[PDB]
Design a protein around this ligand. Structure first.
Ligand code: A1BKK
Length: 167
């Protein structure tokens, strides 16, 4: 039993809700919140900008030190950093950004990072400003993640479309 509330169950392990991931993280304080990161951990907009804003820019400060030490992530890769006031940990995961021409096949690799964590609060990878089809992202999520994932979808219209079209 966990503290996530109001989710629709899609499969044995995947759950979905129309919610602002920032507000959901603040309420649940999950062990792991997933960020929709880029390889430079520049949290300017989208989910990343919102999460970073909620940490009062502490996420960005920590991220800049991470990059200075380690260099950029790989597309499809991830790193574990602090969750600040939102979660114990933040798993920064880089899905391919279609608006940069990146290979959509890397979306499966990106979701594989979730399997290293028993339970996660997450957005749909490569959705929103990353330019992929969120219906496809949900399909890859369900077919790749085996651990327990609670998906927050900000847009109510998109949420209803994802549910109603789910196979
Ligand atoms: C073309 C348009 C429909 O694309 C999208 C628009 C918005 C979302 C969305 O709800 N994003 C979020 N989800 C959870 N927390 C969040 N905090 C801040 C944003 C946010 C998504 Br997934 C989209 F794909």
């Amino acid at each position: 039993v966990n503290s996530f509330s109001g989710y629709l169950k899609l499969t044995d392990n995947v759950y979905i809700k129309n919610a602002d991931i920032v507000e959901e993280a603040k309420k649940v304080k999950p062990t792991v919140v997933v960020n929709a990161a880029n390889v430079y951990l520049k949290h300017g907009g989208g989910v990343a900008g919102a999460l970073n804003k909620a940490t009062n820019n502490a996420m960005q400060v920590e991220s800049d030190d991470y990059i200075a030490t380690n260099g950029p992530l790989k597309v499809g890769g991830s790193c574990v950093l602090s969750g600040h006031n939102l979660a114990k940990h933040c798993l920064h995961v880089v899905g391919p950004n279609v608006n940069k021409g990146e290979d959509i096949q890397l979306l499966k690799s990106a979701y594989e990072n979730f399997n290293q964590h028993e339970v996660l609060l997450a957005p749909l990878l490569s959705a929103g400003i990353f330019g992929a089809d969120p219906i496809h992202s949900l399909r890859v999520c369900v077919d790749t993640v085996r651990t327990n994932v609670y998906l927050a979808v900000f847009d109510k219209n998109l949420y209803d479309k994802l549910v109603s079209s789910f196979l």
